[PDB]
mmCIF file of C-alpha atoms and ligand atoms in Angstrom:
data_model
loop_
_atom_site.group_PDB
_atom_site.id
_atom_site.type_symbol
_atom_site.label_atom_id
_atom_site.label_comp_id
_atom_site.label_asym_id
_atom_site.label_seq_id
_atom_site.Cartn_x
_atom_site.Cartn_y
_atom_site.Cartn_z
ATOM 1 C CA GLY A 1 17.269 50.420 29.137
ATOM 2 C CA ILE A 2 15.028 48.034 27.182
ATOM 3 C CA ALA A 3 11.461 47.179 28.067
ATOM 4 C CA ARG A 4 9.478 44.109 26.987
ATOM 5 C CA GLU A 5 6.990 46.392 25.173
ATOM 6 C CA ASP A 6 9.763 47.472 22.848
ATOM 7 C CA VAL A 7 10.263 43.886 21.675
ATOM 8 C CA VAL A 8 7.910 41.777 19.540
ATOM 9 C CA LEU A 9 8.534 37.991 18.579
ATOM 10 C CA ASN A 10 7.760 37.125 14.987
ATOM 11 C CA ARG A 11 8.974 33.586 14.413
ATOM 12 C CA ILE A 12 11.167 30.858 15.759
ATOM 13 C CA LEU A 13 14.847 30.985 15.000
ATOM 14 C CA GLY A 14 16.005 27.792 16.687
ATOM 15 C CA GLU A 15 16.750 25.804 19.856
ATOM 16 C CA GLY A 16 19.675 27.018 21.957
ATOM 17 C CA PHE A 17 21.131 25.027 24.902
ATOM 18 C CA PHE A 18 18.995 26.750 27.479
ATOM 19 C CA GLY A 19 15.937 27.337 25.315
ATOM 20 C CA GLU A 20 14.285 28.703 22.150
ATOM 21 C CA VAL A 21 15.695 31.559 20.126
ATOM 22 C CA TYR A 22 13.209 33.723 18.331
ATOM 23 C CA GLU A 23 13.360 36.292 15.633
ATOM 24 C CA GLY A 24 11.818 39.713 16.544
ATOM 25 C CA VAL A 25 11.837 43.473 16.137
ATOM 26 C CA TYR A 26 13.086 45.804 18.792
ATOM 27 C CA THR A 27 12.041 49.438 18.666
ATOM 28 C CA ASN A 28 14.583 51.968 19.902
ATOM 29 C CA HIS A 29 14.451 54.903 22.246
ATOM 30 C CA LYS A 30 14.709 56.769 18.876
ATOM 31 C CA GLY A 31 11.871 54.726 17.304
ATOM 32 C CA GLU A 32 14.211 52.722 15.036
ATOM 33 C CA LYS A 33 13.109 49.179 14.281
ATOM 34 C CA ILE A 34 16.007 46.776 14.884
ATOM 35 C CA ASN A 35 15.760 43.122 13.796
ATOM 36 C CA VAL A 36 16.898 41.059 16.768
ATOM 37 C CA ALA A 37 17.314 37.513 17.934
ATOM 38 C CA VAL A 38 15.769 36.952 21.336
ATOM 39 C CA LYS A 39 17.293 34.231 23.515
ATOM 40 C CA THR A 40 15.043 32.516 25.992
ATOM 41 C CA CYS A 41 15.755 30.179 29.010
ATOM 42 C CA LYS A 42 13.410 27.189 29.529
ATOM 43 C CA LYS A 43 11.457 27.682 32.808
ATOM 44 C CA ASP A 44 13.430 24.827 34.481
ATOM 45 C CA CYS A 45 16.635 23.928 36.241
ATOM 46 C CA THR A 46 15.880 26.084 39.282
ATOM 47 C CA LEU A 47 18.914 28.268 40.121
ATOM 48 C CA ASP A 48 21.773 26.464 38.253
ATOM 49 C CA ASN A 49 21.146 26.512 34.507
ATOM 50 C CA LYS A 50 19.198 29.735 34.907
ATOM 51 C CA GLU A 51 22.121 31.299 36.766
ATOM 52 C CA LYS A 52 24.461 30.096 33.963
ATOM 53 C CA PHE A 53 22.066 31.673 31.379
ATOM 54 C CA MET A 54 22.211 35.070 33.019
ATOM 55 C CA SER A 55 25.878 34.888 33.761
ATOM 56 C CA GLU A 56 26.676 34.200 30.108
ATOM 57 C CA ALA A 57 24.420 37.092 29.016
ATOM 58 C CA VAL A 58 26.325 39.528 31.285
ATOM 59 C CA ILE A 59 29.664 38.572 29.899
ATOM 60 C CA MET A 60 28.314 38.993 26.308
ATOM 61 C CA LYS A 61 26.766 42.274 27.424
ATOM 62 C CA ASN A 62 30.175 43.443 28.435
ATOM 63 C CA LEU A 63 31.831 42.110 25.353
ATOM 64 C CA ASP A 64 32.167 44.617 22.601
ATOM 65 C CA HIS A 65 34.332 43.713 19.675
ATOM 66 C CA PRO A 66 33.280 44.289 16.052
ATOM 67 C CA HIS A 67 33.638 40.513 15.394
ATOM 68 C CA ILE A 68 31.816 39.166 18.429
ATOM 69 C CA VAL A 69 28.030 38.862 18.465
ATOM 70 C CA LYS A 70 26.386 42.016 19.709
ATOM 71 C CA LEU A 71 24.119 41.913 22.834
ATOM 72 C CA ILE A 72 21.560 44.706 22.598
ATOM 73 C CA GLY A 73 19.855 44.337 25.945
ATOM 74 C CA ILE A 74 18.567 42.053 28.657
ATOM 75 C CA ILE A 75 15.019 41.742 29.969
ATOM 76 C CA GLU A 76 15.512 40.125 33.347
ATOM 77 C CA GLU A 77 11.975 39.692 34.724
ATOM 78 C CA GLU A 78 10.520 36.187 34.027
ATOM 79 C CA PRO A 79 10.521 35.065 31.282
ATOM 80 C CA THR A 80 14.054 36.364 30.785
ATOM 81 C CA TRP A 81 14.874 37.643 27.288
ATOM 82 C CA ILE A 82 18.393 38.230 25.936
ATOM 83 C CA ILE A 83 18.128 40.560 22.846
ATOM 84 C CA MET A 84 20.964 40.117 20.377
ATOM 85 C CA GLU A 85 21.494 41.668 16.870
ATOM 86 C CA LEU A 86 19.973 39.414 14.273
ATOM 87 C CA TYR A 87 22.532 38.195 11.762
ATOM 88 C CA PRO A 88 20.557 37.649 8.580
ATOM 89 C CA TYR A 89 22.871 35.171 6.830
ATOM 90 C CA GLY A 90 22.789 32.681 9.752
ATOM 91 C CA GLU A 91 25.670 30.354 10.616
ATOM 92 C CA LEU A 92 29.006 30.491 8.822
ATOM 93 C CA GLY A 93 29.163 26.736 8.262
ATOM 94 C CA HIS A 94 25.801 26.768 6.361
ATOM 95 C CA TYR A 95 26.699 30.003 4.609
ATOM 96 C CA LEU A 96 29.982 28.495 3.367
ATOM 97 C CA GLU A 97 28.128 25.411 2.178
ATOM 98 C CA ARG A 98 25.587 27.459 0.162
ATOM 99 C CA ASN A 99 28.150 29.802 -1.351
ATOM 100 C CA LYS A 100 30.911 27.282 -2.042
ATOM 101 C CA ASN A 101 30.945 28.107 -5.775
ATOM 102 C CA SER A 102 31.248 31.886 -5.485
ATOM 103 C CA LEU A 103 33.383 32.471 -2.331
ATOM 104 C CA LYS A 104 36.974 33.207 -3.096
ATOM 105 C CA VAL A 105 40.091 32.763 -0.972
ATOM 106 C CA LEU A 106 40.282 36.472 -0.118
ATOM 107 C CA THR A 107 37.035 36.198 1.810
ATOM 108 C CA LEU A 108 37.900 32.949 3.556
ATOM 109 C CA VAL A 109 41.079 34.684 4.784
ATOM 110 C CA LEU A 110 39.115 37.755 5.845
ATOM 111 C CA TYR A 111 36.643 35.687 7.962
ATOM 112 C CA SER A 112 39.704 33.956 9.520
ATOM 113 C CA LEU A 113 41.302 37.322 10.305
ATOM 114 C CA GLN A 114 38.086 38.715 11.850
ATOM 115 C CA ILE A 115 37.700 35.758 14.163
ATOM 116 C CA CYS A 116 41.357 35.997 15.110
ATOM 117 C CA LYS A 117 40.908 39.726 15.987
ATOM 118 C CA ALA A 118 38.023 38.721 18.244
ATOM 119 C CA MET A 119 40.233 36.078 19.853
ATOM 120 C CA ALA A 120 43.106 38.539 20.264
ATOM 121 C CA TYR A 121 40.700 40.583 22.305
ATOM 122 C CA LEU A 122 39.696 37.628 24.438
ATOM 123 C CA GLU A 123 43.355 36.759 24.745
ATOM 124 C CA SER A 124 44.099 40.173 26.193
ATOM 125 C CA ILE A 125 41.771 39.341 29.121
ATOM 126 C CA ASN A 126 42.888 35.711 29.601
ATOM 127 C CA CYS A 127 39.354 34.658 28.788
ATOM 128 C CA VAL A 128 38.995 31.258 27.129
ATOM 129 C CA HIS A 129 36.435 30.637 24.448
ATOM 130 C CA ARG A 130 35.965 26.982 24.053
ATOM 131 C CA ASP A 131 33.833 26.843 20.973
ATOM 132 C CA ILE A 132 35.709 28.466 18.012
ATOM 133 C CA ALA A 133 33.931 26.613 15.168
ATOM 134 C CA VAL A 134 31.938 27.636 12.045
ATOM 135 C CA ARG A 135 28.669 26.345 13.615
ATOM 136 C CA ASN A 136 29.266 29.023 16.373
ATOM 137 C CA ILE A 137 30.078 31.988 14.102
ATOM 138 C CA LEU A 138 27.299 34.175 12.662
ATOM 139 C CA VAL A 139 27.253 35.977 9.285
ATOM 140 C CA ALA A 140 26.419 39.653 9.497
ATOM 141 C CA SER A 141 27.219 40.423 5.862
ATOM 142 C CA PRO A 142 29.129 38.871 2.984
ATOM 143 C CA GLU A 143 32.091 40.743 4.426
ATOM 144 C CA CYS A 144 31.621 40.407 8.193
ATOM 145 C CA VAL A 145 31.315 37.511 10.639
ATOM 146 C CA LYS A 146 30.887 37.431 14.384
ATOM 147 C CA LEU A 147 32.093 34.899 16.908
ATOM 148 C CA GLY A 148 29.131 33.480 18.838
ATOM 149 C CA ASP A 149 28.556 33.180 22.518
ATOM 150 C CA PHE A 150 30.052 29.957 23.669
ATOM 151 C CA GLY A 151 32.571 30.876 26.367
ATOM 152 C CA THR A 152 29.130 16.719 28.353
ATOM 153 C CA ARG A 153 29.755 15.815 24.621
ATOM 154 C CA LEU A 154 32.890 17.982 24.006
ATOM 155 C CA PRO A 155 34.056 19.089 20.507
ATOM 156 C CA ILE A 156 36.739 16.446 20.478
ATOM 157 C CA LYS A 157 37.672 16.939 16.737
ATOM 158 C CA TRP A 158 38.242 20.662 17.387
ATOM 159 C CA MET A 159 40.255 20.160 20.621
ATOM 160 C CA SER A 160 43.910 20.477 21.469
ATOM 161 C CA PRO A 161 45.661 17.376 22.843
ATOM 162 C CA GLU A 162 45.807 18.954 26.412
ATOM 163 C CA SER A 163 42.077 19.531 26.237
ATOM 164 C CA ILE A 164 41.235 16.023 25.030
ATOM 165 C CA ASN A 165 43.695 14.420 27.487
ATOM 166 C CA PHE A 166 43.291 16.545 30.592
ATOM 167 C CA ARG A 167 40.376 18.902 29.989
ATOM 168 C CA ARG A 168 42.986 21.785 30.184
ATOM 169 C CA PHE A 169 41.754 24.863 28.335
ATOM 170 C CA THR A 170 43.989 27.878 28.066
ATOM 171 C CA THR A 171 44.460 30.618 25.454
ATOM 172 C CA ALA A 172 46.914 28.299 23.748
ATOM 173 C CA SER A 173 44.277 25.534 23.372
ATOM 174 C CA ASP A 174 41.983 28.237 21.889
ATOM 175 C CA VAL A 175 44.856 28.875 19.417
ATOM 176 C CA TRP A 176 44.800 25.167 18.410
ATOM 177 C CA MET A 177 41.009 25.281 18.074
ATOM 178 C CA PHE A 178 41.093 28.581 16.113
ATOM 179 C CA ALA A 179 43.341 26.903 13.500
ATOM 180 C CA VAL A 180 40.861 24.023 13.303
ATOM 181 C CA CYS A 181 38.187 26.714 12.600
ATOM 182 C CA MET A 182 40.410 28.150 9.785
ATOM 183 C CA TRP A 183 40.462 24.672 8.353
ATOM 184 C CA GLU A 184 36.667 24.560 8.457
ATOM 185 C CA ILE A 185 36.470 27.891 6.771
ATOM 186 C CA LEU A 186 38.996 27.012 4.029
ATOM 187 C CA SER A 187 37.264 23.639 3.540
ATOM 188 C CA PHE A 188 33.857 25.314 3.028
ATOM 189 C CA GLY A 189 32.506 23.860 6.259
ATOM 190 C CA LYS A 190 33.737 20.333 6.272
ATOM 191 C CA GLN A 191 33.835 18.839 9.826
ATOM 192 C CA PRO A 192 37.429 18.246 10.949
ATOM 193 C CA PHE A 193 38.436 14.560 11.062
ATOM 194 C CA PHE A 194 35.069 13.691 9.508
ATOM 195 C CA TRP A 195 36.696 10.435 8.515
ATOM 196 C CA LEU A 196 37.256 9.454 12.153
ATOM 197 C CA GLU A 197 35.037 8.720 15.197
ATOM 198 C CA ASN A 198 35.743 10.865 18.281
ATOM 199 C CA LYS A 199 37.570 8.127 20.233
ATOM 200 C CA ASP A 200 40.126 7.913 17.411
ATOM 201 C CA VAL A 201 41.254 11.541 17.177
ATOM 202 C CA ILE A 202 43.745 11.744 20.043
ATOM 203 C CA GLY A 203 45.682 8.762 18.880
ATOM 204 C CA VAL A 204 45.953 10.260 15.373
ATOM 205 C CA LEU A 205 47.123 13.529 16.935
ATOM 206 C CA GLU A 206 49.535 11.756 19.301
ATOM 207 C CA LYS A 207 51.378 10.346 16.287
ATOM 208 C CA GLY A 208 51.826 13.824 14.691
ATOM 209 C CA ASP A 209 49.172 13.479 12.003
ATOM 210 C CA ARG A 210 47.238 16.646 11.207
ATOM 211 C CA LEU A 211 44.284 17.904 9.168
ATOM 212 C CA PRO A 212 45.512 18.048 5.540
ATOM 213 C CA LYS A 213 45.756 21.359 3.697
ATOM 214 C CA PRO A 214 42.438 22.342 2.129
ATOM 215 C CA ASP A 215 42.569 22.698 -1.591
ATOM 216 C CA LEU A 216 42.072 26.485 -1.708
ATOM 217 C CA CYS A 217 44.298 27.146 1.332
ATOM 218 C CA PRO A 218 47.563 28.974 0.463
ATOM 219 C CA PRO A 219 50.652 27.082 1.681
ATOM 220 C CA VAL A 220 51.705 30.035 3.719
ATOM 221 C CA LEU A 221 48.407 29.872 5.532
ATOM 222 C CA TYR A 222 48.643 26.068 6.053
ATOM 223 C CA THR A 223 52.088 26.624 7.654
ATOM 224 C CA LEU A 224 50.421 29.016 10.072
ATOM 225 C CA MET A 225 47.774 26.389 10.847
ATOM 226 C CA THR A 226 50.599 23.858 11.359
ATOM 227 C CA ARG A 227 52.291 26.105 13.946
ATOM 228 C CA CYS A 228 48.942 26.431 15.732
ATOM 229 C CA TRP A 229 48.756 22.621 16.001
ATOM 230 C CA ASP A 230 52.156 22.324 17.690
ATOM 231 C CA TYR A 231 51.741 19.496 20.192
ATOM 232 C CA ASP A 232 53.426 21.711 22.806
ATOM 233 C CA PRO A 233 51.195 24.620 23.781
ATOM 234 C CA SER A 234 54.188 26.984 24.561
ATOM 235 C CA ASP A 235 55.336 26.757 20.980
ATOM 236 C CA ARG A 236 52.012 27.859 19.449
ATOM 237 C CA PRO A 237 51.725 31.439 18.307
ATOM 238 C CA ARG A 238 49.691 33.858 20.324
ATOM 239 C CA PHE A 239 46.659 35.526 18.810
ATOM 240 C CA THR A 240 48.332 38.973 18.617
ATOM 241 C CA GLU A 241 50.957 37.470 16.368
ATOM 242 C CA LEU A 242 48.351 35.536 14.288
ATOM 243 C CA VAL A 243 46.540 38.765 13.682
ATOM 244 C CA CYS A 244 49.739 40.247 12.114
ATOM 245 C CA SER A 245 50.535 37.133 9.977
ATOM 246 C CA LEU A 246 46.866 36.879 8.921
ATOM 247 C CA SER A 247 46.690 40.560 7.900
ATOM 248 C CA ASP A 248 49.750 39.967 5.742
ATOM 249 C CA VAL A 249 48.190 36.904 4.065
ATOM 250 C CA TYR A 250 44.974 38.815 3.564
ATOM 251 C CA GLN A 251 46.764 41.710 2.098
ATOM 252 C CA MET A 252 48.595 39.405 -0.358
ATOM 253 C CA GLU A 253 45.426 37.607 -1.363
ATOM 254 C CA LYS A 254 43.685 41.001 -2.019
ATOM 255 C CA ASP A 255 46.526 42.215 -4.278
ATOM 256 C CA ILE A 256 46.469 38.913 -6.053
ATOM 257 C CA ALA A 257 42.658 39.078 -6.506
ATOM 258 C CA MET A 258 42.770 42.723 -7.687
ATOM 259 C CA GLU A 259 45.563 42.274 -10.321
HETATM 260 N N1 AGS B 301 22.049 36.798 16.691
HETATM 261 C C1 AGS B 301 21.618 35.717 15.899
HETATM 262 N N2 AGS B 301 21.287 35.913 14.623
HETATM 263 C C2 AGS B 301 20.886 34.848 13.911
HETATM 264 N N3 AGS B 301 20.732 33.570 14.270
HETATM 265 C C3 AGS B 301 21.069 33.431 15.552
HETATM 266 C C4 AGS B 301 21.497 34.419 16.393
HETATM 267 N N4 AGS B 301 21.754 33.887 17.643
HETATM 268 C C5 AGS B 301 21.466 32.606 17.566
HETATM 269 N N5 AGS B 301 21.067 32.292 16.306
HETATM 270 C C6 AGS B 301 20.648 30.977 15.825
HETATM 271 O O1 AGS B 301 19.710 30.390 16.751
HETATM 272 C C7 AGS B 301 20.053 29.002 16.853
HETATM 273 C C8 AGS B 301 20.780 28.658 18.163
HETATM 274 O O2 AGS B 301 21.081 29.737 19.032
HETATM 275 P P1 AGS B 301 22.487 29.580 19.864
HETATM 276 O O3 AGS B 301 22.905 30.757 20.725
HETATM 277 O O4 AGS B 301 23.455 28.976 18.880
HETATM 278 O O5 AGS B 301 22.224 28.393 20.917
HETATM 279 P P2 AGS B 301 23.302 28.050 22.089
HETATM 280 O O6 AGS B 301 24.675 28.215 21.499
HETATM 281 O O7 AGS B 301 22.947 26.802 22.848
HETATM 282 O O8 AGS B 301 23.020 29.402 22.957
HETATM 283 P P3 AGS B 301 22.520 29.425 24.520
HETATM 284 O O9 AGS B 301 22.737 30.791 25.148
HETATM 285 O O10 AGS B 301 23.341 28.298 25.089
HETATM 286 S S1 AGS B 301 20.607 28.978 24.440
HETATM 287 C C9 AGS B 301 21.014 28.714 15.699
HETATM 288 O O11 AGS B 301 20.344 28.679 14.430
HETATM 289 C C10 AGS B 301 21.791 29.981 15.682
HETATM 290 O O12 AGS B 301 22.369 30.079 14.411
#
């Protein structure tokens, strides 16, 4: 496994819920130097938050999809370190903001498809991710993003009506939220319903109003987003079907870009 000696902290990366995340270098059993992010848990909330820290680590440790953040190892002895791959382009929302002028639709559709592949995997195990948003999606390379580790100020503007109304979260509410994430991506990181305050969102939804089609979003893709935002969760597509529709859209946008 991994030993603390094999991991050195170089700078701060940022504050996570449970504690500071640092940038470091892990050295392999083969002597390879891997750039890592090291998650830390603040020496605090006795058992409960510290149990939740470890429990979330073990899930991510068992997760292995090419478009979910990669857990490299866990150092359990106090102070506990979770070693993740470092994703050098940071958060998708920031990365979309910076590269607004040069990103084309092909790529926006590709990031959407990647996330949706990750969700199809989660869907296969009836595991609900409740934080499918550009702030929670990391950029591994211009062509590769990874869904972060996020499955009580709730993300109301990202949430399905059932979730806002009853705190029900199912794979179908993740489908609703995933379409909101597509909307963020296609809008270059705008916050959904930025023009409202949280308390106002449900009532807008309840009357059938939806996020408008982003300017660079193909109509075919907006129709997919529309189906995702069906009020009735049974009528929303499943992720396995989104993956197929999204591959088709991607393939069309590539041909269009190439010709
Ligand atoms: N593998 C990574 N590569 C690059 N930046 C990362 C990585 N993991 C986290 N970050 C960044 O570190 C900061 C926050 O870490 P997060 O995991 O988002 O915090 P969090 O979601 O509260 O996580 P925990 O487990 O709850 S502390 C943000 O800047 C993230 O973008």
